[PDB]
Design a protein around this motif. Structure first.
Motif, PDB file in Angstrom:
ATOM      1  N   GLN A 123      60.127  38.952  25.154  1.00  0.00           N
ATOM      2  CA  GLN A 123      60.956  37.762  25.047  1.00  0.00           C
ATOM      3  C   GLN A 123      61.713  37.459  26.332  1.00  0.00           C
ATOM      4  N   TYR A 124      61.617  38.327  27.336  1.00  0.00           N
ATOM      5  CA  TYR A 124      62.215  38.094  28.641  1.00  0.00           C
ATOM      6  C   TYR A 124      61.225  37.538  29.653  1.00  0.00           C
ATOM      7  N   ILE A 125      59.990  37.283  29.242  1.00  0.00           N
ATOM      8  CA  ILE A 125      58.934  36.880  30.153  1.00  0.00           C
ATOM      9  C   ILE A 125      58.599  35.416  29.898  1.00  0.00           C
ATOM     10  N   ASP A 126      58.088  34.759  30.933  1.00  0.00           N
ATOM     11  CA  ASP A 126      57.638  33.382  30.815  1.00  0.00           C
ATOM     12  C   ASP A 126      56.178  33.330  30.382  1.00  0.00           C
ATOM     13  N   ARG A 127      55.763  32.155  29.914  1.00  0.00           N
ATOM     14  CA  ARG A 127      54.365  31.881  29.615  1.00  0.00           C
ATOM     15  C   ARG A 127      53.809  30.699  30.392  1.00  0.00           C
ATOM     16  N   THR A 128      54.645  29.711  30.714  1.00  0.00           N
ATOM     17  CA  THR A 128      54.197  28.566  31.494  1.00  0.00           C
ATOM     18  C   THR A 128      54.057  28.887  32.976  1.00  0.00           C
ATOM     19  N   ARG A 129      54.546  30.047  33.419  1.00  0.00           N
ATOM     20  CA  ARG A 129      54.445  30.479  34.813  1.00  0.00           C
ATOM     21  C   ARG A 129      53.838  31.880  34.830  1.00  0.00           C
ATOM     22  N   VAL A 130      52.508  31.949  34.850  1.00  0.00           N
ATOM     23  CA  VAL A 130      51.771  33.207  34.880  1.00  0.00           C
ATOM     24  C   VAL A 130      50.738  33.125  35.996  1.00  0.00           C
ATOM     25  N   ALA A 131      50.642  34.182  36.802  1.00  0.00           N
ATOM     26  CA  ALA A 131      49.747  34.183  37.950  1.00  0.00           C
ATOM     27  C   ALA A 131      49.083  35.543  38.107  1.00  0.00           C
ATOM     28  N   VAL A 132      47.965  35.549  38.830  1.00  0.00           N
ATOM     29  CA  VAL A 132      47.215  36.765  39.120  1.00  0.00           C
ATOM     30  C   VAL A 132      46.781  36.734  40.580  1.00  0.00           C
ATOM     31  N   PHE A 133      46.827  37.894  41.231  1.00  0.00           N
ATOM     32  CA  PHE A 133      46.390  38.039  42.610  1.00  0.00           C
ATOM     33  C   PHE A 133      45.566  39.311  42.741  1.00  0.00           C
ATOM     34  N   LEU A 154      29.923  46.215  35.253  1.00  0.00           N
ATOM     35  CA  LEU A 154      30.993  45.858  36.172  1.00  0.00           C
ATOM     36  C   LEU A 154      31.618  44.525  35.787  1.00  0.00           C
ATOM     37  N   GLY A 155      32.940  44.453  35.909  1.00  0.00           N
ATOM     38  CA  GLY A 155      33.667  43.222  35.706  1.00  0.00           C
ATOM     39  C   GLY A 155      33.937  42.837  34.270  1.00  0.00           C
ATOM     40  N   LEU A 156      33.550  43.651  33.292  1.00  0.00           N
ATOM     41  CA  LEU A 156      33.736  43.260  31.899  1.00  0.00           C
ATOM     42  C   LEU A 156      34.748  44.127  31.167  1.00  0.00           C
ATOM     43  N   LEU A 157      34.598  45.452  31.213  1.00  0.00           N
ATOM     44  CA  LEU A 157      35.527  46.324  30.500  1.00  0.00           C
ATOM     45  C   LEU A 157      36.933  46.228  31.085  1.00  0.00           C
ATOM     46  N   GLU A 158      37.053  46.346  32.410  1.00  0.00           N
ATOM     47  CA  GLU A 158      38.360  46.198  33.041  1.00  0.00           C
ATOM     48  C   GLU A 158      38.921  44.799  32.832  1.00  0.00           C
ATOM     49  N   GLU A 159      38.050  43.794  32.719  1.00  0.00           N
ATOM     50  CA  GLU A 159      38.521  42.455  32.388  1.00  0.00           C
ATOM     51  C   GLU A 159      39.288  42.473  31.074  1.00  0.00           C
ATOM     52  N   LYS A 160      38.728  43.121  30.049  1.00  0.00           N
ATOM     53  CA  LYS A 160      39.435  43.242  28.777  1.00  0.00           C
ATOM     54  C   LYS A 160      40.676  44.114  28.903  1.00  0.00           C
ATOM     55  N   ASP A 161      40.646  45.120  29.780  1.00  0.00           N
ATOM     56  CA  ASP A 161      41.843  45.923  30.010  1.00  0.00           C
ATOM     57  C   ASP A 161      42.994  45.058  30.514  1.00  0.00           C
ATOM     58  N   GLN A 162      42.728  44.215  31.514  1.00  0.00           N
ATOM     59  CA  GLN A 162      43.784  43.327  31.992  1.00  0.00           C
ATOM     60  C   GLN A 162      44.090  42.212  30.995  1.00  0.00           C
ATOM     61  N   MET A 163      43.125  41.819  30.160  1.00  0.00           N
ATOM     62  CA  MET A 163      43.432  40.894  29.068  1.00  0.00           C
ATOM     63  C   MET A 163      44.478  41.483  28.133  1.00  0.00           C
ATOM     64  N   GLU A 164      44.287  42.740  27.734  1.00  0.00           N
ATOM     65  CA  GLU A 164      45.263  43.385  26.863  1.00  0.00           C
ATOM     66  C   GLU A 164      46.583  43.602  27.588  1.00  0.00           C
ATOM     67  N   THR A 203      39.762  36.413  40.729  1.00  0.00           N
ATOM     68  CA  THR A 203      38.993  35.205  40.459  1.00  0.00           C
ATOM     69  C   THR A 203      38.431  35.227  39.044  1.00  0.00           C
ATOM     70  N   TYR A 204      37.935  36.382  38.604  1.00  0.00           N
ATOM     71  CA  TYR A 204      37.286  36.487  37.305  1.00  0.00           C
ATOM     72  C   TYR A 204      38.297  36.499  36.156  1.00  0.00           C
ATOM     73  N   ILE A 205      39.593  36.394  36.455  1.00  0.00           N
ATOM     74  CA  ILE A 205      40.660  36.531  35.464  1.00  0.00           C
ATOM     75  C   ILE A 205      41.373  35.193  35.273  1.00  0.00           C
ATOM     76  N   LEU A 206      40.617  34.097  35.272  1.00  0.00           N
ATOM     77  CA  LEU A 206      41.239  32.823  34.916  1.00  0.00           C
ATOM     78  C   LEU A 206      40.750  32.317  33.560  1.00  0.00           C
ATOM     79  N   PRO A 207      41.274  32.855  32.444  1.00  0.00           N
ATOM     80  CA  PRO A 207      40.863  32.368  31.123  1.00  0.00           C
ATOM     81  C   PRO A 207      41.788  31.302  30.557  1.00  0.00           C
TER      82      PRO A 207
END
Lengths: 709, 705
Positions: free
Chosen positions: A559-569, A540-550, A579-583
């Motif tokens: 090129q239409y997306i920002d990088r300095t303004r990225v958030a997760v909820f 639990l919490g590891l494979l899906e973590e990599k899924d959302q990483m990808e 919480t587990y997705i703050l790398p």
């Protein structure tokens, strides 16, 4: 934007109830376009009665009204019976009790007979003037239950407050007895009651502890009110058992599902209601668990061969959930399994079967896992799948339906990606005769504001085609940069990428504050293979973590997306993920998320219900070696610069505040930067409109502040 | 550094640890006798240690943890005077277990110890533990130790036993909590199944614990109890001061629950008969009820501190002589000290002539100077220390048994100083402690420039202190950050030395910090004390906005960046200072904060709320304008923050949660932080530094631009 959905049900094979559209309750007849008026605006004077139900003889109406549920839907309160035309409102009172709160009454299968439950005591009333009969009263306040669901059943497996079933003859009643006495009772703090408020205790079986005992019994709806218990199967791996649901196959035979405590062994048992003898009709088992114990066999009127649904190997992509036809009384020599349909998809539900030929109606994701459509097939060996909608209207792709008594007609609903199209169709012509409800006000509302551009960019990972959906502010340009927000659910057995119409905060800041939101369904997402679902088991919490990483990496390719303004909820288990997705990506191009947020996360699953933790990581209380690394305290080590926020009501029942307190202790031990917010003495499912506005306003304000620059 | 030296005789004082070992310094010729060495390490680092009155046994208190503000509960072990030989102090048939208090006697090696709220006494170390009294209960019957209220609100100290001068009897208070409502503090971390912890917290208008006084003999040992007075308006009473007048007579102060009628009574310890001596009444309440009497060797006329009318500027705290056995018709009341100034407390009295030593604010309210007067009618009050050392405005002198020598502690406004002096010559023969590490730290760091700008409002002058980052200029703008405490009966602005979060933030970012003694500050006449009677959170805020307006007329003080901060009641005031100045000139502040504030006093203890707002339970109608609910209405975008530990028994987290509920009904942006299951005072240094880190991390972002 409010939906005036009536959501009627077929009272007879020719007509449905035709519930409220804009007030008074009519009764539409499909035969010749007839809508007989049965209830007037008199419900306004019934102390604003929230819920109403019509007796099977359409001669008495029950009207229930209260202030608030308890766990998910505790539709208690005052219940009043009224004559079908109008007049004479009398409060249904239990014996030797005046007008008092009533948990639930409901209706019988025939005439005006009913029951009602007060303090776990079923009281039967064959007539309006019939005295309530103390049929069963062994249930106790929070200790023993019968006829209703506790927190565990109503929140984990049963998902329904009612826990009893009416026999077709209207003479017997099947009720489940729950022994919660063994369950540890935990209290929720009160900070608003009085000068000396008291805590609120309820039984909550945590991971590694024991689980409440369960049994099934039958009572009589007349005369002796005779009760008979049904013996559970006694397999060597079924020391502790669960009854998910039961259904009256006949008025004397009941289909029961028994799932072991390890949840990897399930048994379908045909038990005699009038005798108590239980006969196993099917057995299934798996290495890890038995997923989707929330299905019902389609038993015929005469109790002939029924239509169940189960996991068939489906060749590649693992085993898929497909329909199966099984004989009425299968012999022990062999099983009569016969998959009606087969494909890289699943049947979400099976509507019904027409005894007058070969017509099995069901809802399935046959088109795509992210869309739901109505299909039909033939029970005999031809197995010719037949369209009913299959994109009947281009605007709506989601679908659901409910057929009449003899499949003569059926109500249908779109509810995605367009406004809910409640309509009446027939199995023969498969053509709309008229519109039941369309909510054109919502149509012109969404046409009156900048409805965000919906689009889908599915990804591929391992041997899986992972779904994905992405939003644009309807004024989007590819050159201009936009801040990114991710919404994570990751609930085992759930799906986030679906083509169902819904409007919420995400659309609110997409259209107004100019955001692009991503919904993904990583490993372990439902409706995309039992193998994929079991990938995350014990991980639990590891494979899906990599899924959302990808997912984040692919969204950063734009090129239409920002990088300095990225958030997760996220929320609930999705809150734990978020919480587990703050790398910090790599080591040079770190700062993956500018701002973070969560809502009622589940830090340690030992601090959660056993039925979840044991199911998804194995039984605790034995040093499972799986609840340690799943604690986010290890991963919250970095927490370099992201602005982190927690939302948690004080009186949460599903996800205790202990999780938030422990995570805050971890933050203190890690000197993390964050900002907590609390709702004093509030239920978890949070069913208040104004409070919902406040919560969404807080979320959007925080996200726009962390996105303003 | 601190020697914390106390006198054994006129010649010698204990001269406790400075940087390790403990020598017994003697005033006569600088004679530091060898008593304690580095042996203290082996006893599991006993934080506190004491010496038996015969100077033959040393008591170590190891594995001692603080429950309340000061709950010295732990393991007490006795040891021989030279070194070594520890032994566990235990009640009979009890193994090594935590003891809430041990204490020490005045003579020999006699001692006591409290276990399960029960006093057990032994005249000798080798004496078997004796069940002298075992009637106490866990949290219900306290004897020898104070409850929450006495340790916190009225008695201000956990110890509740007073030894007789001859060491023959003990005076202790029996506190019954069976008539007290209880609070179940929510626990979130104890186990997988954390359960609440119950403790009797009497709120406003509740039933306070019932206190009785008892005296137990140490030889032969039957208890004897005293009658308090029975005035009609003191049906509920508390013991606010008690001290042995003689070896057989004891002075006790009984104060009504209205806290405005107090009686000082001399009672026989060996008989229990009480003899009324003095009474004191005021319309609002009484101040400094803990003032111990200053008796003589023969038990003659004693010294008291009375708020005598003093003509102008309201009544003032001055010393008064009460004869040994005053006549029934009237006493021999007579004030010694006079003038528009107050005596903080009386140091000592010389029975061999006329020399009463005390500290006072005669020079300035924020300065403490030593003055010695005469009991005879001349009343020659002489300043002895005055300006012995330039960097000493605060003073604290502890005089010897024959009083010819004393120990003077400076404590600011520079490095704190400890020195030995003689009362006659006022001569510094040597320095006890200069706090060398403190000097070397302050020299190597940017000390902030301290200055004062006092304000005047109505008939009250309120002192104010303002700081600079030692790099003050004009081209730089200094964001103002008000700090408000406003504790009734307390002083918030003074010339003491400190190192705190304000120092760090001034040093790092140069934001000026303003402290003003708002209305209700003590030691400036009882008129200012009783002005805010039933008027809490209403008049100090006026003083604060006028003071910050005066400081805001400076151009180098900006309007965009203005902050307010406070803790406890000061937190609530800080919240109460978030207005909208008119409508055009809004944004009165920029970032606001509080630390466990109190908004609705009906959810607070009786001894505090009823002391100023009247006794609750009868709709006093005064509590109801004290809520910041109306003052937190607009709060458009200015930052608002709260810090509150979960188990704050001082101010319950229920206060903060109710504020959150009201904010939700008001729909205003805010923030919040939690310390799950810790006490109010942050006993662990790690929690304190995390609090400071959070405070500075928030406050930097609310001004940086």
């Amino acid at each position: 934007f409010k939906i005036h959905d009536p959501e009627a049900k077929w009272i007879s094979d020719t007509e449905f109830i035709y519930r409220e559209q804009k007030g008074t309750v009519r009764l539409w007849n499909v035969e010749t376009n007839t809508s007989t008026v049965l209830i007037e605006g008199k419900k306004i004077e019934s102390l604003r009665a929230i819920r109403y139900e019509i007796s099977p003889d359409r001669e008495y109406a029950l009207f229930s009204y209260n202030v608030e549920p308890i766990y998910q839907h505790s539709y208690t309160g005052y219940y009043v019976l009224s004559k079908i035309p109008h007049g004479d409102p009398q409060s249904l009172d239990p014996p030797e009790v005046s007008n008092a709160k009533l948990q639930y009454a409901g209706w019988g299968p025939k005439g005006q007979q009913l029951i009602f439950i007060f303090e776990n005591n079923i009281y039967y009333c064959a007539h309006v003037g019939k005295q309530a009969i103390r049929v069963v009263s062994t249930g106790k306040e929070g200790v023993i239950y019968n006829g209703l669901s506790d927190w565990l059943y109503e929140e984990e497996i049963l998902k329904t407050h009612i826990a009893h079933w009416w026999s077709p003859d209207g003479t017997r009643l099947a009720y489940a007895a729950i022994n919660d006495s063994r369950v540890p009772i935990m209290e929720l703090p009160t900070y608003t009651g009085s000068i000396y408020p008291t805590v609120k205790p309820y039984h909550y079986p945590k991971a590694g502890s024991e689980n409440p005992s369960i049994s099934l019994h039958v009572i009589g709806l007349n005369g002796p009110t005779h009760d008979l218990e049904m013996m559970p199967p006694d397999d060597p791996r079924m020391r502790e058992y669960y009854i998910t649901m039961v259904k009256w196959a006949t008025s004397t035979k009941v289909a029961v599902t028994w799932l072991n405590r390890a949840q990897n062994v399930s048994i379908l048992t045909l038990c005699d209601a009038t005798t108590g003898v239980c006969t196993k009709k099917h057995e299934d088992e798996s290495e890890a668990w038995l997923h989707r114990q929330n299905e019902e066999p389609v038993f015929s009127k005469d109790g002939r061969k029924f239509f169940f649904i189960r996991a068939i190997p489906q060749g590649g992509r693992g085993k898929f959930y497909h329909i199966t036809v099984s004989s009425s009384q299968p012999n022990s020599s062999n099983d009569n399994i016969q998959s009606i349909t087969s494909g890289d998809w699943d049947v979400t539900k099976i509507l019904a079967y027409d005894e007058k030929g070969n017509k099995i109606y069901f809802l399935s994701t046959e088109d795509l896992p992210r869309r739901r459509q109505l299909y039909s097939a033939n029970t005999v060996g031809n197995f010719n799948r037949q369209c009913l909608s299959c994109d009947l209207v281009e605007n709506c792709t989601y679908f659901s339906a409910s057929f009449s008594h003899s499949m003569d007609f059926f109500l249908l609903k779109c509810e995605g990606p367009g406004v809910p199209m409640v309509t009446v169709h027939n199995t023969t012509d498969k053509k709309k005769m008229f519109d039941l409800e369309t909510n054109e006000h919502v149509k012109k509302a969404i046409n009156d504001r900048q409805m965000p551009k919906v689009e889908y960019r599915d990804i591929e990972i391992d041997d899986y085609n992972l779904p994905m959906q992405i939003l644009k502010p309807a004024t989007f340009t590819d050159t201009t940069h936009y801040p990114l927000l991710l919404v994570v659910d990751g609930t085992p057995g759930s799906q986030s990428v679906a083509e169902k119409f819904e409007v919420s905060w995400e659309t609110v800041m997409v259209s107004s504050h100019g955001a692009v939101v991503v919904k993904c369904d990583g490993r372990g997402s439902g409706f995309q293979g039992t193998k994929l679902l079991h990938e995350v088991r014990r991980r639990l919490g590891l494979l899906e973590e990599k899924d959302q990483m990808e997912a984040v990496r692919t969204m950063l390719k734009e090129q239409y997306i920002d990088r300095t303004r990225v958030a997760v909820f996220g929320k609930d288990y999705g809150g734990y993920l978020s919480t587990y997705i703050l790398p910090a990506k790599g080591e040079n191009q770190g700062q993956t998320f500018t701002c973070g947020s969560a809502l009622s996360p589940i830090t340690d699953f030992k601090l959660y219900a056993s039925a979840f933790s044991e199911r998804y990581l194995g039984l605790h209380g034995l040093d499972n070696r799986a609840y340690e690394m799943t604690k986010v305290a290890h991963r919250v080590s970095a927490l370099e610069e992201q602005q982190f926020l927690i939302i948690h009501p004080t009186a949460d029942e599903k996800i205790h505040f202990q999780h938030t307190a422990e995570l805050i202790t971890q933050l203190i031990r890690g000197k993390a930067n964050y900002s907590l917010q609390i709702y004093p003495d509030e239920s978890h499912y949070f069913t208040s409109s104004s409070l919902k506005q406040h919560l969404y306003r807080s979320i959007i304000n925080f996200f726009v502040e962390c996105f303003r620059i | 550094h601190d020697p914390e030296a106390k006198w054994i005789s006129d010649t010698e004082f204990i001269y406790r640890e400075q940087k390790g070992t403990v020598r017994l310094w003697n005033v006569e010729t600088n004679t530091s006798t060898v008593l304690i060495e580095g042996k203290k390490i082996e006893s599991l680092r006993a934080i506190r240690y004491e010496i038996s009155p015969d100077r033959e046994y040393a008591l170590f208190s190891y594995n001692v943890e603080p429950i309340y503000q000061h709950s010295y509960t732990g393991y007490y072990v006795l040891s021989k005077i030279p070194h070594g030989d520890p032994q566990s102090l235990d009640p009979p048939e009890v193994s090594n277990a935590k003891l809430q208090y041990a204490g020490w006697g005045p003579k020999g090696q006699q001692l006591i110890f409290i276990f399960e709220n029960n006093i057990y006494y032994c005249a000798h170390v080798g004496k078997q533990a004796i069940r002298v009294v075992s009637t106490g209960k866990e949290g219900v019957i306290y004897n020898g130790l104070s409850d929450w209220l006495y340790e916190e609100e009225i008695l201000k100290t956990h110890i509740a036993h007073w030894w007789s001068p001859d060491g023959t009897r003990l005076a202790y208070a029996a506190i019954n909590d069976s008539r007290v409502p209880i609070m179940e503090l929510p626990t979130y971390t104890g186990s997988i199944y954390p359960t609440v912890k119950p403790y009797h917290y009497p709120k406003a208008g509740s039933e306070n614990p019932s206190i009785s006084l008892h005296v137990i003999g140490l030889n032969g040992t039957h208890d004897l109890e005293m009658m308090p007075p029975d005035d009609p308006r003191m049906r509920e009473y508390y013991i606010t001061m008690v001290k042995w007048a003689t070896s057989t007579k004891v002075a006790v102060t009984w104060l009504n629950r209205a806290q405005n009628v107090s009686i000082l009574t001399l009672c026989d310890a060996t008989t229990g008969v009480c003899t009324k001596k003095h009474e004191d009444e005021s319309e609002a309440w009484l101040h400094r009820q803990n003032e111990e009497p200053v008796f003589s060797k023969d038990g003659r006329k004693f010294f008291f501190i009375r708020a005598i009318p003093q003509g102008g500027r309201g009544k003032f705290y001055h010393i008064t002589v009460s004869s040994s056995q005053p006549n029934s018709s009237n006493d021999n009341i007579q004030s010694i000290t006079s003038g528009d100034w107050d005596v903080t407390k009386i140091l000592a009295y010389d029975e061999k002539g006329n020399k009463i030593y005390f500290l006072s604010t005669e020079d300035l309210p924020r300065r403490r100077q030593l003055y010695s007067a005469n009991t005879v009618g001349n009343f020659n009050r002489q300043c002895l220390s005055c300006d012995l050392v330039e960097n000493c405005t605060y003073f604290s002198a502890s005089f010897s048994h024959s009083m010819d020598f004393f120990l003077l502690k400076c404590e600011g406004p520079g490095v704190p100083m400890v020195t030995v002096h003689n009362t006659t010559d006022k001569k510094k023969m040597f320095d006890l402690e200069t706090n060398e590490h403190v000097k070397k730290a302050i020299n190597d760091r940017q000390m902030p420039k301290v200055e004062y700008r006092d304000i005047e409002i109505d008939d009250y002058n309120l002192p104010m202190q303002i700081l600079k980052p030692a790099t003050f200029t004009d081209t730089t703008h200094y964001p103002l950050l008000l700090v408000v405490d406003g504790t009734p009966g307390s002083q918030s602005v003074a010339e003491k030395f400190e190192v705190s979060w304000e120092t760090v933030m001034v040093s790092s970012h140069g934001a000026v910090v303003v402290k003003c003694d708002g209305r209700g500050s003590g030691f400036q006449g009882t008129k200012l004390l009783h002005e805010v009677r039933r008027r809490l959170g209403l008049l100090e805020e006026k003083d604060q906005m006028e003071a910050v307006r005066t400081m805001l007329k400076e151009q180098y003080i900006d309007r965009t960046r203005v902050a307010v901060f406070g803790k406890d009641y000061g937190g609530y005031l800080s919240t109460y200072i978030l207005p909208a100045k008119g409508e055009n000139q809004g944004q009165t502040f920029t970032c606001g904060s509080a630390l466990s504030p109190i908004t609705d006093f009906k959810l607070y203890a009786s001894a505090f709320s009823e002391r100023y707002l009247g006794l609750h339970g009868l709709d006093n109608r005064a509590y109801e304008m004290t809520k910041v609910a109306h003052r937190v209405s607009a709060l458009e975008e200015q930052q608002f923050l709260i810090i509150h530990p979960t188990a704050d028994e001082k101010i319950h987290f229920q206060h903060t949660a109710e504020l959150i509920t009201q904010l939700i009904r008001g729909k205003a942006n805010y923030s919040l932080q939690i310390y799950p299951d810790e006490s109010h005072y942050f006993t662990s240094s790690s929690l304190k530094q995390h609090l400071y880190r959070s405070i500075i991390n928030f406050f930097v972002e609310c001004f940086r631009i």
